[PDB]
PDB file of C-alpha atoms in Angstrom:
ATOM      1  CA  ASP A 191      -3.578  15.406  31.546  1.00  0.00           C
ATOM      2  CA  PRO A 192      -3.908  15.735  27.512  1.00  0.00           C
ATOM      3  CA  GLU A 193      -0.580  14.923  25.941  1.00  0.00           C
ATOM      4  CA  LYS A 194      -0.230  11.613  28.334  1.00  0.00           C
ATOM      5  CA  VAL A 195      -3.728  10.493  27.022  1.00  0.00           C
ATOM      6  CA  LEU A 196      -3.333  11.402  23.468  1.00  0.00           C
ATOM      7  CA  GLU A 197       0.026  10.007  22.641  1.00  0.00           C
ATOM      8  CA  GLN A 198      -1.446   7.070  24.494  1.00  0.00           C
ATOM      9  CA  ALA A 199      -4.195   6.549  22.513  1.00  0.00           C
ATOM     10  CA  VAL A 200      -1.875   6.721  19.369  1.00  0.00           C
ATOM     11  CA  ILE A 201       0.490   4.298  20.935  1.00  0.00           C
ATOM     12  CA  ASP A 202      -2.458   1.733  21.392  1.00  0.00           C
ATOM     13  CA  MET A 203      -3.248   1.963  17.379  1.00  0.00           C
ATOM     14  CA  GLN A 204       0.695   0.885  16.462  1.00  0.00           C
ATOM     15  CA  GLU A 205       0.111  -2.213  18.525  1.00  0.00           C
ATOM     16  CA  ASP A 206      -3.106  -2.978  16.925  1.00  0.00           C
ATOM     17  CA  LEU A 207      -2.081  -2.667  13.110  1.00  0.00           C
ATOM     18  CA  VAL A 208       0.272  -5.252  13.976  1.00  0.00           C
ATOM     19  CA  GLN A 209      -2.072  -7.652  15.380  1.00  0.00           C
ATOM     20  CA  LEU A 210      -4.149  -7.576  12.237  1.00  0.00           C
ATOM     21  CA  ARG A 211      -1.297  -7.724  10.247  1.00  0.00           C
ATOM     22  CA  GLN A 212      -0.327 -11.300  12.039  1.00  0.00           C
ATOM     23  CA  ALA A 213      -4.226 -12.233  11.696  1.00  0.00           C
ATOM     24  CA  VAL A 214      -3.513 -11.484   7.694  1.00  0.00           C
ATOM     25  CA  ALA A 215      -0.591 -13.473   7.541  1.00  0.00           C
ATOM     26  CA  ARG A 216      -2.276 -16.238   9.429  1.00  0.00           C
ATOM     27  CA  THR A 217      -5.008 -16.316   6.681  1.00  0.00           C
ATOM     28  CA  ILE A 218      -2.360 -16.417   4.242  1.00  0.00           C
ATOM     29  CA  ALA A 219      -1.206 -19.317   5.625  1.00  0.00           C
ATOM     30  CA  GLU A 220      -4.978 -21.004   5.663  1.00  0.00           C
ATOM     31  CA  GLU A 221      -4.947 -20.450   2.007  1.00  0.00           C
ATOM     32  CA  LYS A 222      -1.589 -21.668   1.302  1.00  0.00           C
ATOM     33  CA  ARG A 223      -2.452 -24.743   3.391  1.00  0.00           C
ATOM     34  CA  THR A 224      -5.511 -25.257   1.615  1.00  0.00           C
ATOM     35  CA  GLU A 225      -4.322 -25.001  -1.759  1.00  0.00           C
ATOM     36  CA  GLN A 226      -1.157 -27.549  -1.088  1.00  0.00           C
ATOM     37  CA  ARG A 227      -3.813 -30.156   0.132  1.00  0.00           C
ATOM     38  CA  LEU A 228      -6.621 -29.509  -2.491  1.00  0.00           C
ATOM     39  CA  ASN A 229      -3.982 -29.839  -5.166  1.00  0.00           C
ATOM     40  CA  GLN A 230      -2.618 -33.114  -4.184  1.00  0.00           C
ATOM     41  CA  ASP A 231      -5.690 -34.408  -3.061  1.00  0.00           C
ATOM     42  CA  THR A 232      -7.469 -33.885  -6.370  1.00  0.00           C
ATOM     43  CA  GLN A 233      -4.458 -35.809  -7.818  1.00  0.00           C
ATOM     44  CA  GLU A 234      -4.933 -38.749  -5.505  1.00  0.00           C
ATOM     45  CA  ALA A 235      -7.988 -39.121  -7.032  1.00  0.00           C
ATOM     46  CA  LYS A 236      -6.776 -39.714 -10.184  1.00  0.00           C
ATOM     47  CA  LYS A 237      -4.134 -41.952  -8.860  1.00  0.00           C
ATOM     48  CA  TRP A 238      -6.756 -44.342  -7.311  1.00  0.00           C
ATOM     49  CA  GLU A 239      -8.615 -44.266 -10.424  1.00  0.00           C
ATOM     50  CA  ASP A 240      -5.349 -44.996 -12.458  1.00  0.00           C
ATOM     51  CA  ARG A 241      -4.955 -48.113 -10.150  1.00  0.00           C
ATOM     52  CA  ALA A 242      -8.633 -49.123 -10.794  1.00  0.00           C
ATOM     53  CA  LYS A 243      -7.272 -48.841 -15.022  1.00  0.00           C
ATOM     54  CA  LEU A 244      -4.767 -51.503 -14.123  1.00  0.00           C
ATOM     55  CA  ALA A 245      -7.529 -53.671 -12.774  1.00  0.00           C
ATOM     56  CA  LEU A 246      -9.262 -52.730 -16.100  1.00  0.00           C
ATOM     57  CA  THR A 247      -6.642 -53.654 -17.937  1.00  0.00           C
ATOM     58  CA  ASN A 248      -7.266 -57.089 -16.928  1.00  0.00           C
ATOM     59  CA  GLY A 249      -8.428 -58.771 -13.552  1.00  0.00           C
ATOM     60  CA  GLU A 250     -10.235 -57.645 -10.346  1.00  0.00           C
ATOM     61  CA  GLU A 251     -13.305 -55.985 -10.766  1.00  0.00           C
ATOM     62  CA  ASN A 252     -12.793 -55.958  -6.873  1.00  0.00           C
ATOM     63  CA  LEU A 253     -10.115 -53.864  -6.861  1.00  0.00           C
ATOM     64  CA  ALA A 254     -11.292 -51.970  -9.448  1.00  0.00           C
ATOM     65  CA  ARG A 255     -14.822 -50.690  -7.346  1.00  0.00           C
ATOM     66  CA  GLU A 256     -12.420 -50.574  -4.464  1.00  0.00           C
ATOM     67  CA  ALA A 257     -10.433 -48.394  -6.083  1.00  0.00           C
ATOM     68  CA  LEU A 258     -13.556 -46.181  -7.000  1.00  0.00           C
ATOM     69  CA  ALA A 259     -13.978 -46.155  -3.254  1.00  0.00           C
ATOM     70  CA  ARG A 260     -10.490 -44.344  -2.925  1.00  0.00           C
ATOM     71  CA  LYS A 261     -11.633 -41.917  -5.568  1.00  0.00           C
ATOM     72  CA  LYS A 262     -14.803 -40.901  -3.923  1.00  0.00           C
ATOM     73  CA  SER A 263     -13.536 -40.608  -0.368  1.00  0.00           C
ATOM     74  CA  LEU A 264     -10.904 -38.396  -1.991  1.00  0.00           C
ATOM     75  CA  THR A 265     -13.761 -36.008  -4.152  1.00  0.00           C
ATOM     76  CA  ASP A 266     -15.389 -35.809  -1.030  1.00  0.00           C
ATOM     77  CA  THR A 267     -12.641 -34.657   0.994  1.00  0.00           C
ATOM     78  CA  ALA A 268     -12.017 -32.085  -1.765  1.00  0.00           C
ATOM     79  CA  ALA A 269     -15.564 -30.657  -1.875  1.00  0.00           C
ATOM     80  CA  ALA A 270     -14.932 -30.122   2.193  1.00  0.00           C
ATOM     81  CA  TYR A 271     -11.810 -28.385   1.551  1.00  0.00           C
ATOM     82  CA  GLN A 272     -13.368 -26.370  -1.369  1.00  0.00           C
ATOM     83  CA  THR A 273     -16.015 -25.294   1.491  1.00  0.00           C
ATOM     84  CA  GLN A 274     -13.385 -24.681   4.091  1.00  0.00           C
ATOM     85  CA  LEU A 275     -11.461 -22.438   1.065  1.00  0.00           C
ATOM     86  CA  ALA A 276     -14.560 -20.363   0.836  1.00  0.00           C
ATOM     87  CA  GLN A 277     -14.566 -19.582   4.508  1.00  0.00           C
ATOM     88  CA  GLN A 278     -10.636 -18.701   4.101  1.00  0.00           C
ATOM     89  CA  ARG A 279     -11.174 -16.019   1.302  1.00  0.00           C
ATOM     90  CA  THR A 280     -14.394 -14.683   2.926  1.00  0.00           C
ATOM     91  CA  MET A 281     -12.523 -14.149   6.342  1.00  0.00           C
ATOM     92  CA  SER A 282      -9.310 -12.830   4.401  1.00  0.00           C
ATOM     93  CA  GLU A 283     -11.192 -10.119   2.722  1.00  0.00           C
ATOM     94  CA  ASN A 284     -13.155  -9.237   5.947  1.00  0.00           C
ATOM     95  CA  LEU A 285      -9.358  -8.868   7.483  1.00  0.00           C
ATOM     96  CA  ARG A 286      -8.349  -6.975   4.491  1.00  0.00           C
ATOM     97  CA  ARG A 287     -11.482  -4.649   4.749  1.00  0.00           C
ATOM     98  CA  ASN A 288     -11.347  -3.922   8.641  1.00  0.00           C
ATOM     99  CA  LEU A 289      -7.293  -3.454   8.414  1.00  0.00           C
ATOM    100  CA  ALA A 290      -7.749  -0.791   5.543  1.00  0.00           C
ATOM    101  CA  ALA A 291     -10.398   0.906   6.992  1.00  0.00           C
ATOM    102  CA  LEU A 292      -8.279   0.778  10.733  1.00  0.00           C
ATOM    103  CA  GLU A 293      -5.274   2.398   9.122  1.00  0.00           C
ATOM    104  CA  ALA A 294      -7.413   5.018   7.771  1.00  0.00           C
ATOM    105  CA  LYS A 295      -9.322   5.520  11.275  1.00  0.00           C
ATOM    106  CA  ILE A 296      -5.869   5.448  12.887  1.00  0.00           C
ATOM    107  CA  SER A 297      -3.926   7.597  10.663  1.00  0.00           C
ATOM    108  CA  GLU A 298      -6.489  10.610  10.883  1.00  0.00           C
ATOM    109  CA  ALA A 299      -7.435   9.996  14.653  1.00  0.00           C
ATOM    110  CA  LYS A 300      -3.710  10.579  15.243  1.00  0.00           C
ATOM    111  CA  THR A 301      -3.195  13.424  12.849  1.00  0.00           C
ATOM    112  CA  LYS A 302      -6.371  15.322  13.838  1.00  0.00           C
ATOM    113  CA  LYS A 303      -5.476  14.958  17.427  1.00  0.00           C
ATOM    114  CA  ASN A 304      -1.713  16.176  16.719  1.00  0.00           C
ATOM    115  CA  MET A 305      -2.821  19.337  14.796  1.00  0.00           C
ATOM    116  CA  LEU A 306      -5.706  20.168  17.241  1.00  0.00           C
ATOM    117  CA  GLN A 307      -3.065  19.774  20.062  1.00  0.00           C
ATOM    118  CA  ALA A 308      -0.741  22.075  17.907  1.00  0.00           C
ATOM    119  CA  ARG A 309      -3.538  24.632  17.221  1.00  0.00           C
ATOM    120  CA  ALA A 310      -4.981  24.506  20.989  1.00  0.00           C
ATOM    121  CA  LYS A 311      -1.233  24.831  22.415  1.00  0.00           C
ATOM    122  CA  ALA A 312      -0.938  28.051  19.622  1.00  0.00           C
ATOM    123  CA  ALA A 313      -4.447  29.435  20.794  1.00  0.00           C
ATOM    124  CA  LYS A 314      -3.545  29.324  24.274  1.00  0.00           C
ATOM    125  CA  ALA A 315      -0.005  30.946  23.447  1.00  0.00           C
ATOM    126  CA  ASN A 316      -2.096  34.035  21.819  1.00  0.00           C
ATOM    127  CA  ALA A 317      -4.348  34.006  25.029  1.00  0.00           C
ATOM    128  CA  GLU A 318      -1.033  34.105  26.806  1.00  0.00           C
ATOM    129  CA  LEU A 319      -0.090  36.930  25.377  1.00  0.00           C
ATOM    130  CA  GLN A 320      -3.367  38.875  26.357  1.00  0.00           C
ATOM    131  CA  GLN A 321      -2.726  37.766  29.865  1.00  0.00           C
ATOM    132  CA  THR A 322       0.716  39.382  29.996  1.00  0.00           C
ATOM    133  CA  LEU A 323      -0.294  42.269  28.298  1.00  0.00           C
ATOM    134  CA  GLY A 324      -3.016  42.287  31.028  1.00  0.00           C
ATOM    135  CA  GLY A 325       0.041  42.200  33.547  1.00  0.00           C
ATOM    136  CA  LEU A 326       0.205  46.094  32.718  1.00  0.00           C
ATOM    137  CA  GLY A 327       2.579  48.251  34.083  1.00  0.00           C
ATOM    138  CA  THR A 328       0.062  50.401  35.645  1.00  0.00           C
ATOM    139  CA  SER A 329       0.968  49.373  38.776  1.00  0.00           C
ATOM    140  CA  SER A 330       2.552  49.759  42.646  1.00  0.00           C
ATOM    141  CA  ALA A 331       5.695  51.263  40.866  1.00  0.00           C
ATOM    142  CA  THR A 332       3.479  54.459  40.742  1.00  0.00           C
ATOM    143  CA  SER A 333       2.822  53.892  44.365  1.00  0.00           C
ATOM    144  CA  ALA A 334       6.838  53.803  44.835  1.00  0.00           C
TER     145      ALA A 334
ATOM    146  CA  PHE B   6      11.498 -37.542   5.414  1.00  0.00           C
ATOM    147  CA  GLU B   7       8.193 -36.994   6.284  1.00  0.00           C
ATOM    148  CA  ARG B   8       9.332 -34.782   9.493  1.00  0.00           C
ATOM    149  CA  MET B   9      11.309 -32.894   7.380  1.00  0.00           C
ATOM    150  CA  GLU B  10       8.532 -32.468   4.568  1.00  0.00           C
ATOM    151  CA  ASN B  11       6.212 -31.412   7.388  1.00  0.00           C
ATOM    152  CA  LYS B  12       8.384 -28.442   7.439  1.00  0.00           C
ATOM    153  CA  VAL B  13       8.327 -28.237   3.649  1.00  0.00           C
ATOM    154  CA  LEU B  14       4.673 -27.830   3.932  1.00  0.00           C
ATOM    155  CA  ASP B  15       5.445 -25.345   6.426  1.00  0.00           C
ATOM    156  CA  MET B  16       7.531 -23.037   3.692  1.00  0.00           C
ATOM    157  CA  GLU B  17       4.516 -23.889   1.618  1.00  0.00           C
ATOM    158  CA  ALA B  18       2.633 -22.306   4.371  1.00  0.00           C
ATOM    159  CA  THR B  19       4.647 -19.629   4.789  1.00  0.00           C
ATOM    160  CA  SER B  20       4.235 -18.915   0.901  1.00  0.00           C
ATOM    161  CA  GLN B  21       0.216 -18.692   1.777  1.00  0.00           C
ATOM    162  CA  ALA B  22       1.700 -16.211   4.375  1.00  0.00           C
ATOM    163  CA  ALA B  23       3.863 -14.613   1.568  1.00  0.00           C
ATOM    164  CA  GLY B  24       0.985 -14.416  -0.596  1.00  0.00           C
ATOM    165  CA  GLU B  25      -1.455 -13.565   2.297  1.00  0.00           C
ATOM    166  CA  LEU B  26       0.410 -10.551   2.251  1.00  0.00           C
ATOM    167  CA  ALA B  27       1.332  -9.891  -1.360  1.00  0.00           C
ATOM    168  CA  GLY B  28      -1.323  -7.825  -2.410  1.00  0.00           C
ATOM    169  CA  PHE B  29      -0.635  -3.710  -1.156  1.00  0.00           C
ATOM    170  CA  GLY B  30      -2.832  -1.253  -3.313  1.00  0.00           C
ATOM    171  CA  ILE B  31       0.699  -0.112  -4.996  1.00  0.00           C
ATOM    172  CA  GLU B  32       0.048  -1.959  -8.214  1.00  0.00           C
ATOM    173  CA  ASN B  33      -0.612   1.479  -9.796  1.00  0.00           C
ATOM    174  CA  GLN B  34       2.989   2.125  -9.671  1.00  0.00           C
ATOM    175  CA  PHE B  35       3.416  -0.104 -12.631  1.00  0.00           C
ATOM    176  CA  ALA B  36       1.567   2.073 -15.030  1.00  0.00           C
ATOM    177  CA  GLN B  37       3.807   5.064 -15.973  1.00  0.00           C
ATOM    178  CA  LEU B  38       6.452   2.363 -16.752  1.00  0.00           C
ATOM    179  CA  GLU B  39       3.816   0.860 -19.013  1.00  0.00           C
ATOM    180  CA  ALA B  40       3.021   4.494 -20.250  1.00  0.00           C
ATOM    181  CA  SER B  41       6.565   5.505 -20.983  1.00  0.00           C
ATOM    182  CA  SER B  42       7.082   2.001 -22.547  1.00  0.00           C
ATOM    183  CA  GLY B  43       4.485   3.133 -24.948  1.00  0.00           C
ATOM    184  CA  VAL B  44       6.814   6.503 -25.321  1.00  0.00           C
ATOM    185  CA  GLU B  45       9.564   4.379 -26.146  1.00  0.00           C
ATOM    186  CA  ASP B  46       7.449   2.555 -28.924  1.00  0.00           C
ATOM    187  CA  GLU B  47       6.715   6.144 -30.072  1.00  0.00           C
ATOM    188  CA  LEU B  48      10.523   6.633 -30.518  1.00  0.00           C
ATOM    189  CA  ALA B  49      10.593   3.397 -32.654  1.00  0.00           C
ATOM    190  CA  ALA B  50       7.729   5.060 -34.275  1.00  0.00           C
ATOM    191  CA  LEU B  51       9.945   7.989 -35.153  1.00  0.00           C
ATOM    192  CA  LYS B  52      12.609   5.795 -36.264  1.00  0.00           C
ATOM    193  CA  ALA B  53      10.203   4.398 -38.776  1.00  0.00           C
TER     194      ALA B  53
ATOM    195  CA  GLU C 258      19.547   8.086 -26.327  1.00  0.00           C
ATOM    196  CA  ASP C 259      22.869   7.189 -28.669  1.00  0.00           C
ATOM    197  CA  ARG C 260      22.810   3.571 -27.140  1.00  0.00           C
ATOM    198  CA  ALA C 261      19.065   3.533 -27.978  1.00  0.00           C
ATOM    199  CA  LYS C 262      19.908   4.420 -31.739  1.00  0.00           C
ATOM    200  CA  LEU C 263      22.180   1.381 -31.426  1.00  0.00           C
ATOM    201  CA  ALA C 264      18.951  -0.653 -31.163  1.00  0.00           C
ATOM    202  CA  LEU C 265      17.364   1.572 -33.871  1.00  0.00           C
ATOM    203  CA  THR C 266      20.088   0.837 -36.199  1.00  0.00           C
ATOM    204  CA  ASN C 267      19.046  -2.682 -35.952  1.00  0.00           C
ATOM    205  CA  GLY C 268      17.699  -5.238 -33.095  1.00  0.00           C
ATOM    206  CA  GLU C 269      16.305  -4.750 -29.768  1.00  0.00           C
ATOM    207  CA  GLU C 270      13.113  -2.118 -29.300  1.00  0.00           C
ATOM    208  CA  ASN C 271      13.163  -3.575 -25.637  1.00  0.00           C
ATOM    209  CA  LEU C 272      16.753  -2.348 -25.339  1.00  0.00           C
ATOM    210  CA  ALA C 273      15.405   0.961 -27.231  1.00  0.00           C
ATOM    211  CA  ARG C 274      12.646   2.007 -24.902  1.00  0.00           C
ATOM    212  CA  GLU C 275      14.973   0.644 -21.870  1.00  0.00           C
ATOM    213  CA  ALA C 276      17.555   3.313 -23.228  1.00  0.00           C
ATOM    214  CA  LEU C 277      14.697   6.172 -23.113  1.00  0.00           C
ATOM    215  CA  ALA C 278      13.979   5.101 -19.278  1.00  0.00           C
ATOM    216  CA  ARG C 279      17.475   5.794 -18.634  1.00  0.00           C
ATOM    217  CA  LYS C 280      17.506   9.228 -20.833  1.00  0.00           C
ATOM    218  CA  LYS C 281      13.973   9.848 -18.933  1.00  0.00           C
ATOM    219  CA  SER C 282      15.790   9.266 -15.541  1.00  0.00           C
ATOM    220  CA  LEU C 283      18.367  11.371 -16.496  1.00  0.00           C
ATOM    221  CA  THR C 284      16.304  14.344 -17.792  1.00  0.00           C
ATOM    222  CA  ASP C 285      14.308  14.491 -14.585  1.00  0.00           C
ATOM    223  CA  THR C 286      17.213  14.450 -12.252  1.00  0.00           C
ATOM    224  CA  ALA C 287      18.902  17.343 -14.305  1.00  0.00           C
ATOM    225  CA  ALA C 288      15.178  18.870 -13.514  1.00  0.00           C
ATOM    226  CA  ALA C 289      15.848  18.567  -9.820  1.00  0.00           C
ATOM    227  CA  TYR C 290      19.311  19.917  -9.996  1.00  0.00           C
ATOM    228  CA  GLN C 291      18.197  22.999 -12.319  1.00  0.00           C
ATOM    229  CA  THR C 292      15.634  23.572  -9.202  1.00  0.00           C
ATOM    230  CA  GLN C 293      18.671  22.968  -6.934  1.00  0.00           C
ATOM    231  CA  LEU C 294      20.868  25.797  -8.662  1.00  0.00           C
ATOM    232  CA  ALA C 295      18.078  28.180  -8.551  1.00  0.00           C
ATOM    233  CA  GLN C 296      18.463  28.207  -4.586  1.00  0.00           C
ATOM    234  CA  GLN C 297      22.260  28.409  -4.822  1.00  0.00           C
ATOM    235  CA  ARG C 298      22.097  31.700  -6.982  1.00  0.00           C
ATOM    236  CA  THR C 299      19.355  33.203  -4.447  1.00  0.00           C
ATOM    237  CA  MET C 300      21.195  32.237  -1.638  1.00  0.00           C
ATOM    238  CA  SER C 301      24.427  33.326  -3.160  1.00  0.00           C
ATOM    239  CA  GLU C 302      22.861  36.781  -3.702  1.00  0.00           C
ATOM    240  CA  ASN C 303      21.517  36.605  -0.139  1.00  0.00           C
ATOM    241  CA  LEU C 304      24.974  36.545   0.943  1.00  0.00           C
ATOM    242  CA  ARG C 305      26.489  38.801  -1.130  1.00  0.00           C
TER     243      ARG C 305
ATOM    244  CA  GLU D  94      -5.060  14.245  -9.205  1.00  0.00           C
ATOM    245  CA  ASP D  95      -2.183  13.217 -11.408  1.00  0.00           C
ATOM    246  CA  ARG D  96      -2.769   9.714 -10.102  1.00  0.00           C
ATOM    247  CA  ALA D  97      -6.107   9.861 -10.953  1.00  0.00           C
ATOM    248  CA  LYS D  98      -5.083  10.945 -14.439  1.00  0.00           C
ATOM    249  CA  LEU D  99      -3.053   7.668 -14.945  1.00  0.00           C
ATOM    250  CA  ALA D 100      -6.356   5.812 -14.633  1.00  0.00           C
ATOM    251  CA  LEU D 101      -7.805   8.169 -17.103  1.00  0.00           C
ATOM    252  CA  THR D 102      -4.871   7.553 -19.647  1.00  0.00           C
ATOM    253  CA  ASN D 103      -6.571   4.015 -19.348  1.00  0.00           C
ATOM    254  CA  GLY D 104      -7.679   1.644 -17.017  1.00  0.00           C
ATOM    255  CA  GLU D 105      -8.921   1.956 -13.394  1.00  0.00           C
ATOM    256  CA  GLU D 106     -11.993   4.242 -12.422  1.00  0.00           C
ATOM    257  CA  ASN D 107     -11.893   2.712  -8.876  1.00  0.00           C
ATOM    258  CA  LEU D 108      -8.490   4.015  -8.830  1.00  0.00           C
ATOM    259  CA  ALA D 109      -8.976   7.381 -10.358  1.00  0.00           C
ATOM    260  CA  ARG D 110     -12.330   8.168  -7.954  1.00  0.00           C
ATOM    261  CA  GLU D 111      -9.834   6.970  -5.250  1.00  0.00           C
ATOM    262  CA  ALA D 112      -7.423   9.496  -6.158  1.00  0.00           C
ATOM    263  CA  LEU D 113     -10.217  11.936  -6.046  1.00  0.00           C
ATOM    264  CA  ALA D 114     -10.840  11.107  -2.383  1.00  0.00           C
ATOM    265  CA  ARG D 115      -7.262  11.747  -1.694  1.00  0.00           C
ATOM    266  CA  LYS D 116      -7.527  15.127  -3.421  1.00  0.00           C
ATOM    267  CA  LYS D 117     -10.544  15.895  -1.542  1.00  0.00           C
ATOM    268  CA  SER D 118      -9.200  15.117   1.683  1.00  0.00           C
ATOM    269  CA  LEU D 119      -5.910  17.030   0.856  1.00  0.00           C
ATOM    270  CA  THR D 120      -8.194  20.044  -0.085  1.00  0.00           C
ATOM    271  CA  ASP D 121     -10.154  20.003   2.966  1.00  0.00           C
ATOM    272  CA  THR D 122      -7.301  19.916   5.281  1.00  0.00           C
ATOM    273  CA  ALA D 123      -5.973  22.918   3.419  1.00  0.00           C
ATOM    274  CA  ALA D 124      -8.852  24.719   4.146  1.00  0.00           C
ATOM    275  CA  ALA D 125      -8.478  23.647   7.599  1.00  0.00           C
ATOM    276  CA  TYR D 126      -5.089  24.666   7.850  1.00  0.00           C
ATOM    277  CA  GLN D 127      -6.025  28.334   5.735  1.00  0.00           C
ATOM    278  CA  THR D 128      -8.443  28.939   8.485  1.00  0.00           C
ATOM    279  CA  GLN D 129      -5.745  28.226  11.283  1.00  0.00           C
ATOM    280  CA  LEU D 130      -3.162  30.779   9.653  1.00  0.00           C
ATOM    281  CA  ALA D 131      -5.873  33.423   9.724  1.00  0.00           C
ATOM    282  CA  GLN D 132      -5.618  32.919  13.647  1.00  0.00           C
ATOM    283  CA  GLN D 133      -1.867  33.301  13.261  1.00  0.00           C
ATOM    284  CA  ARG D 134      -1.644  36.491  11.645  1.00  0.00           C
ATOM    285  CA  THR D 135      -4.433  38.065  13.729  1.00  0.00           C
ATOM    286  CA  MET D 136      -2.614  36.883  17.116  1.00  0.00           C
ATOM    287  CA  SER D 137       0.370  38.119  15.361  1.00  0.00           C
ATOM    288  CA  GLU D 138      -0.681  41.642  14.857  1.00  0.00           C
ATOM    289  CA  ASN D 139      -2.205  41.465  18.485  1.00  0.00           C
ATOM    290  CA  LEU D 140       0.986  40.708  19.493  1.00  0.00           C
ATOM    291  CA  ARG D 141       2.808  43.386  17.609  1.00  0.00           C
TER     292      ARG D 141
END
């Protein structure tokens, strides 16, 4: 039966747009989370380089190069997180485009089905005029 | 202090979600505000 | 618009164009109400 | 089309042609509804 199906398809679309909104929000969390890390991380590299400068000021070359190892380790981690960020932004624009398209698709799918239903219903109503007129009075009333 | 900071960072993650939401395609709505700002500046040019 | 002229007298172009925005907003509303009035007068003569 | 003229005023050709797509989509829908109207008027005189 038509109305049941056509409305059901539209109902499904309302779920879908919310699901992809979650995924967008999730992606916003990924960017936020990586920003939070990368921002601090890059400062941590400085902090340990500063600790190295304390050894430069006087004293331990061992501490100084140890502190370089911290700086390096952090630097390397920040490159990994910079890479991870590219995956987030690419996936984000993927969701964004998928959504924007899906929303247009949903919108017109619903609207076309509705106006089709309306014109189909109107068409059968006009046909029902012709049928009911075909229910002519040229009948067994004559026989009576 | 860390546990509750892990929730601070969750609010920062909520701020990634706020930014991840933040673009809407409605930014064009600013444009006539800017144009009409120019209009009130033409009224300043009328004043002098 | 008079409040805008106060800024013209001296001071704030920001106030002046802000006051243009009020003037505009009102003007626009008055056009809407002028339209509404046409619907009233037409409906009135219809009833009459 | 007016929203497109805002981009003409200054700024985004992308917005401008995007706004053409809205204008086109609407235009196309209006032709479909104009067609539907012919079916209504014909059916109306049929009933009459």
